[PDB]
């Protein structure tokens, strides 16, 4: 599909919030552990994401995630418009690696690493880079 389409959602583990972004065209994932499931966190995350990738449109499974003024401000400034089982796979790898790390965020980043590097025969990271490069 379009190379600038992303998907953004939050999942929960150990009473903590995990913000997950998926480059739909590729399956590449970015994730962060946030204290509160607030629009301020979502907006800051969006700013980080747009400065790194060409983000055209963002989809979500909880539309109310994108109603706060802070979120709309972030999408406005970065020129972003609104528009899986990835949470389940990521939760799988997280469960697999959880005991190697004290904090949940470390295991989250470990799982992101594994998922993006996994070969399927390019990997998710290779796929996102190649799609965005080709589009150039």
Q: Which residue, 69 or 96, is less far from ligand 7SK as judged by CB?
A: 69
6 alpha-carbon distance from chain centroid: 8
How far apart are the C-alpha atoms of 38 and 92, rounded to whole Å? 25
Residue 124 · residue 112 · CB < 8 Å: no
Please tell me whether residue 101 binds ligand 7SK under the rule CB under 6 A: yes
Fill in the per-residue mask, 4 to 43: x = in contact with its own copies (CB under 8 A), - = not in contact: --------------------------x-------------
C-alpha–C-alpha distance, residues 12 and 116, integer Å = 21
Which residues in 1-136 belong to E strands, given as ranges? 5-13, 16-23, 28-34, 57-59, 81-82
Query: Among all chains, which residue has been given the structure tokens 């790898």?
Result: 93
Query: CB under 8 A: which stretch of 11-19, 57-65, 85-93, 104-112 binds its own copies?
Result: 104-112
Question: Which residues contact its own copies by CB under 8 A?
Answer: 30, 44, 47-48, 50-54, 77-78, 105-106, 109-110, 112-113, 116-117, 122, 125-126, 129-130, 132-134, 136
| Binding-site ranges for ligand 7SK (CB under 6 A) | 40, 43-44, 47, 69-70, 73-74, 77, 100-103, 106, 110
């Amino acid at each position: 599909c379009s190379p600038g389409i992303w998907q953004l959602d939050c999942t929960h583990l150990e009473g903590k919030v995990i913000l997950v972004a998926v480059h739909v065209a590729s399956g590449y994932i970015e994730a962060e552990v946030i204290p509160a499931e607030t629009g301020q966190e979502t907006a800051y995350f969006l700013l980080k994401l747009a400065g790194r990738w060409p983000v055209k449109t963002v989809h979500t499974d909880n539309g109310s995630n994108f109603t706060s003024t802070t979120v709309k401000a972030a999408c406005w400034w970065a020129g972003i418009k609104q528009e899986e089982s990835m949470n389940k796979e990521l939760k799988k790898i997280i469960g697999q690696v959880r005991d190697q790390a004290e904090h949940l965020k470390t295991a989250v980043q470990m799982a992101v690493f594994i998922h993006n590097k996994k070969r399927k025969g390019y990997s998710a990271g290779e796929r996102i880079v190649d799609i965005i490069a080709t589009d150039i």
